[PDB]
Design a protein around this ligand. Structure first.
Ligand SMILES: Nc1ncnc2c1ncn2[C@@H]1O[C@H](COP(=O)(O)OP(=O)(O)OC[C@H]2O[C@H](O)[C@H](O)[C@@H]2O)[C@@H](O)[C@H]1O
Length: 182
């Protein structure tokens, strides 16, 4: 009921429509991306600096690092929202890599609608040190978007890009997209 056709606008990039949203997966370094929100995949303390969280915090800068620690105090947070620092985004949403990926992506999508944001970039949450299986992660990310669209919640959000660090993970996402295509 929602899926378009998988196509490729550049080598190593694949996209398909999911309702009104363009869902893209691409190879690369997320810190090179521009989007309204960039998603960080971190630990329960929000001060992880290994893997994608290291790339993100080192590029975002020390003010963002301070923001994370401060917010982590305030509450028993499931995710936190900070400024983008020196990343090319309006906000970073920091989710926990070990947490349910579908829930995490749903939260991200909701927060983006709240801010009338149109673009999101995220990594393959949980597929590194968290050791969540890439196919389960892919399934969860795409499921979250499909559910969002089904519920009629997608109004401002128009583009969701997963930036993926290795071929092995890219191929899994592509397979999961291809399985769903109309
Ligand atoms: N610059 C980058 N851009 C995009 N993706 C990247 C980059 N660098 C790495 N990746 C990919 O980012 C993906 C995620 O790898 P990880 O950064 O380990 O995060 P997690 O979510 O698995 O674990 C985070 C915490 O969650 C749990 O508590 C765990 O115990 C951790 O403490 C991999 O595919 C990387 O190749």
């Amino acid at each position: 009921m929602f899926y378009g056709t998988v196509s490729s606008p550049d080598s190593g990039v694949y996209e398909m429509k999911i309702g009104s949203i363009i869902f893209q997966v691409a190879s690369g370094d997320i810190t090179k991306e521009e989007a309204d929100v960039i998603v960080n995949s971190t630990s329960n303390s929000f001060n992880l600096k290994a893997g994608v969280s290291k790339a993100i915090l080192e590029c975002a800068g020390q003010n963002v690092e301070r923001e994370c620690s401060q917010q982590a105090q305030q509450r028993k947070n499931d995710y936190i929202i900070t400024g983008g620092g020196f990343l090319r985004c309006k906000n970073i949403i920091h989710v926990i890599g070990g947490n349910d990926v579908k829930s995490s992506v749903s939260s991200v999508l909701q927060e983006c609608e709240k801010k009338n944001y149109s673009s999101i970039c995220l990594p393959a949450i949980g597929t590194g040190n968290a050791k969540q299986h890439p196919d389960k992660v892919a399934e969860a990310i795409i499921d979250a978007i499909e559910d969002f669209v089904q519920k009629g919640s997608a109004q401002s959000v128009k583009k969701v890009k997963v930036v993926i660090f290795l071929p092995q993970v890219l191929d899994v996402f592509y397979a999961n997209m291809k399985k769903r295509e109309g």
